[PDB]
């Protein structure tokens, strides 16, 4: 059961470098690539993320794509950068210009065949292939355009596998890019047709986690990318270690998605707490559940109290009793019953895995399907309509060649997604 990773654009390549550091640490792989681990449990599932080189060494199954090699050059110079296969780095000779239309239509079609060739070479080598995993930002240029292009091509070529994306989305308070509404709207239009499941993270939520919860004096992008790599590596933990109640990406999708358009999820990770306050409270399943539902530990700016949970999933790592898990999930569902959709008799799936991350006794990652995501799409659609009515920056996209009808189609599809979420929020049995 093998995963193929794709890293696209600056954000994707930077998060990927930290992810592969975390994964190499968890499996005891030296930065030279030699296995140096200390239990057979580490070795017996190494195939899931690593390919095997001949003597000691293991090589990681990842494709790196960008239009200018600067980010790749930064990751290759990093402490673990050498592990990556040289042939897996694909780059052009001129930048995306932070423009979606360039990234999708002009430099996209120039590079895409070499990326598809590398992805096919990696996919056809597996004895049984599990889903693809893609990291990119939606506000950027090459990330949005080529990520969604590649996703569409892989969905044509591999329609029976799983398609998973991790995606960075614009903060509600401060923009990092002026043309964010166009790139976001077009990317969400592509994703809602093509994708099976998409996770969304706000950089503002990571800043608030670091400053308020962890009380870090001088946080850096390494910390935000470590938080993301921690949750990403947690979702896959049941694929690659033993446990009392195994789980799988397809099983998560089957329990989380009621209808095929409603596949956008919120993420959180629970045992966040500052080193000074750790002495006051010990680790236990009630404590993890309390942190798990605390909005302080959720990676988006929208708050659950303005919506309702359709479904949720919790993956627990560590040696613990099933009784405490079951009774905690029952007590939380009964005590907060107005925030859970009533025509589903039980909204939470649990899973339990024996092996925690090093130096923590227990951890849980939380995935939530909540209607408050509609507020984000509504905000993006508002900002899009403000820009489009006035043709605010439209000549760049039209000069590349896009029909305005593309913009009206993407707006209509997102507006229907918002309406569908709002209707299911307020539905009733009658």
């Amino acid at each position: 059961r093998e995963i193929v990773c794709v890293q696209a654009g600056q954000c994707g390549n930077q998060i990927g470098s930290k992810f592969w550091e975390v994964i190499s640490d968890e499996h005891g792989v030296d930065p030279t690539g030699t296995y140096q681990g200390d239990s057979d449990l580490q070795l017996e599932r190494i195939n899931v993320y690593f390919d095997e080189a001949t003597g000691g060494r293991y090589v990681p199954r990842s494709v790196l794509i960008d239009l200018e090699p600067g980010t790749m050059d930064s990751v290759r110079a990093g402490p673990y950068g050498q592990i990556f296969r040289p042939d897996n780095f694909i780059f052009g000779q001129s930048g995306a210009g932070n423009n979606w239309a360039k990234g999708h239509y002009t430099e996209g079609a120039e590079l895409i065949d070499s990326v598809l060739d590398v992805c096919c070479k990696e996919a056809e080598s597996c004895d049984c292939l599990q889903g693809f995993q893609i990291c990119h930002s939606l506000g950027g240029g090459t990330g949005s355009g080529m990520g969604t292009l590649l996703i569409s091509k892989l969905r044509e070529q591999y329609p029976d596998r799983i398609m998973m994306t991790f995606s960075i989305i614009p903060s509600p308070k401060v923009s990092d890019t002026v043309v964010e509404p166009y790139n976001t709207t077009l990317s969400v239009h592509q994703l809602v047709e093509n994708s099976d499941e998409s996770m969304c993270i706000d950089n503002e939520a990571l800043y608030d986690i670091c400053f308020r919860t962890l009380k870090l004096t001088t946080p850096t992008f390494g910390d935000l990318n470590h938080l993301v790599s921690a949750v990403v590596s947690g979702v896959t933990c049941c694929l690659r270690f033993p446990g009392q109640l195994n789980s799988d990406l397809r099983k998560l999708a089957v329990n989380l998605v009621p209808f095929p358009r409603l596949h956008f999820f919120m993420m959180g990770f629970a045992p966040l707490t500052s080193r000074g306050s750790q002495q006051y409270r010990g680790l236990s399943v009630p404590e993890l559940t309390q942190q798990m539902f605390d909005a302080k530990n959720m990676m988006q700016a929208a708050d659950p109290r303005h919506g309702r949970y359709l479904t949720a999933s919790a993956l627990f790592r560590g040696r613990m009793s099933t009784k405490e898990v079951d009774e905690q999930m029952l007590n939380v569902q009964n005590k907060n019953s107005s925030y859970f959709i009533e025509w589903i008799p039980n909204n939470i799936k649990s899973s339990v895995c024996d092996i925690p991350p090093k130096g923590l006794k227990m951890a849980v990652t939380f995935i939530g399907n909540n209607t408050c995501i509609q507020e984000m799409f509504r905000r993006v659609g508002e900002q899009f309509t403000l820009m489009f009515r006035r043709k605010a920056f439209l000549h760049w996209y039209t000069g590349e060649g896009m029909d305005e009808m593309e913009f009206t189609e993407a707006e209509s599809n997102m507006n229907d997604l918002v309406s569908e979420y709002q209707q299911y929020q307020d539905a009733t049995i009658e």
Partner: protein, 55 residues
């Protein structure tokens, strides 16, 4: 009389790849409800093949 698996062991394009640069045109954009038909979206893909399901 059946194929070995529900997953296709027969496929036209594998590791050889296909010409994807010639398929992208700005005047042939994607429309609503025009995505790839997939078993997760509720379409019975297995009925197109010759795989014999359990009666």
């Amino acid at each position: 009389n059946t194929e070995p698996s529900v997953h296709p062991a027969k496929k036209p394009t594998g590791t050889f790849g296909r010409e994807a640069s010639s398929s992208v045109n700005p005047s042939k954009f994607l429309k609503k409800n025009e995505g790839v038909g997939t078993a997760s979206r509720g379409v019975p893909i297995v009925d197109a093949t010759k795989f014999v399901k359990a009666e």
